[PDB]
């Protein structure tokens, strides 16, 4: 239809929450481990277990990081979102 | 107190369930269902799809297990592609 769809508004919400956290420290277009952690603990508090150990955020970032800069760009973050959403769906069958 | 990010994720599941459920396999998107999703729900981001050839190309790209249809995991890859492309034009 002509209204922004639920789908289109979801996509927009993804962009906004990323820039909401990536903009805090250092590079505003990437999530340092610092920023990724805060995102997970505050916004995925129903899907993912809270992160409080440093060993954990290390491991998460390693898997998300494909270009090897130690940070998460938007493409990598979308991959993360894809992964998590797939899991919640899987826990609805 | 569910978050914007989580609500957004749930809507992805919901929009998939809506279109996959119309025809055929109620858990997968066939070409026609995929095309309607793009024309009905992604009309402000993607150019309308009018040709079958294009539907074909899109499904071939998305279909990683070779069954001619698109499951949820294959759809999420689609949402990432698209969302990433838009992020780059904003």
């Amino acid at each position: 239809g002509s209204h922004m769809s639920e789908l289109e508004k979801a996509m927009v919400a993804l962009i906004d929450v990323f820039h909401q956290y990536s903009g805090r420290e250092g590079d505003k277009h990437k999530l340092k481990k610092s920023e990724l952690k805060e995102l997970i603990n505050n916004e995925l508090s129903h899907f993912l277990e809270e992160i409080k150990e440093q060993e954990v955020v290390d491991k998460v970032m390693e898997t998300l990081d494909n270009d090897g800069d130690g940070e998460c760009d938007f493409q990598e973050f979308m991959a993360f979102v894809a992964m998590v959403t797939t899991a919640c769906h899987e826990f609805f069958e | 107190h569910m978050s914007e990010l989580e609500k957004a994720m749930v809507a992805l599941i919901d929009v998939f369930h809506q279109y996959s459920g119309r025809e055929g396999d109620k858990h997968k998107l066939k070409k026609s269902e995929l095309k309607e999703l793009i024309n009905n729900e992604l009309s402000h981001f993607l150019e309308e799809i009018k040709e079958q050839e294009v539907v074909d190309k899109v499904m071939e790209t998305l279909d990683n297990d070779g069954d001619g249809e698109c499951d949820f995991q294959e759809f999420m890859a689609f949402v990432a592609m698209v969302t990433t492309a838009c992020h780059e034009f904003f």
Binding site: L48, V56, K59, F91 | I38, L46, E47, F89
Partner: peptide, 22 residues
């Protein structure tokens, strides 16, 4: 109308720990 032509361990860990409801 800015549109494209349509041609363009730890996660199991944090999803397993999602345990609640006694």
């Amino acid at each position: 109308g800015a549109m494209a032509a349509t041609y363009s361990e730890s996660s199991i860990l944090a999803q397993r720990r999602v345990r609640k409801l006694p």
